[PDB]
Amino acid sequence: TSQVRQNYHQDSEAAINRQINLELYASYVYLSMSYYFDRDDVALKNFAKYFLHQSHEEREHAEKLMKLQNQRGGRIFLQDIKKPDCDDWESGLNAMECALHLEKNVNQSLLELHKLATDKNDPHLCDFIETHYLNEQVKAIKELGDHVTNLRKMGAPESGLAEYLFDKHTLG
């Protein structure tokens, strides 16, 4: 056993490794989305910048979980990072919708992890999830929802003008 390990269930250790993979997957999804908007036939530079930033934020989320694993005396086990479900993201609206779905999926995983930490009476792990993950998820979901709403109301995806103006005035 690790000399630092205390009140850290093997199930929690495994669940943290699963979450590390999911955060890295989210980073990869946003990386793919970003460069879609950098295509010469899409050409929305602020969509590209927004998603690239989100990609880097997800890598930080993964790194903090790796730090947590070691802090508690668990051992990191990495798996393949799956490619994103799409190569072509269709439109600014469709990418925002996919990002919303992604964030809600990652949120569900975090809630299941918190439930496990509660079941195993691990208040340090509960606090870690609450402090560093749960409100960040709620804010990200709300922001993406707001963006989807704007784009729909402006007439996307059929209006290329709508996506252009949203790119300039909200993401720029």
Residues 3-62 close enough to bind Cl ion by CB under 5 A: 5-10, 14, 17-18, 21
Rank residues 11 and 125 by Cβ distance to its own copies and give the closer one. 125
Token reading at 116: 């496990």
Q: What is the CA radius of gyration of the chain?
A: 18
137 is in an annotated binding site: yes
CB of 12: closest distance to Fe ion in angstroms?
18
- Minimum distance from residue 143 beta carbon to Cl ion (Å): 6
> Is 58 part of any known ligand binding site?
yes
The DSSP secondary-structure symbol of 134 reads I
Helix axis angle for 92-119 and 135-154, nearest 10°, is 160
CA distance 123 to 84: 34
As annotated, the binding site includes 23, 58, 61, 103, 137
Q: Name the binding residues for Fe cation.
A: 23, 58, 61, 103, 137
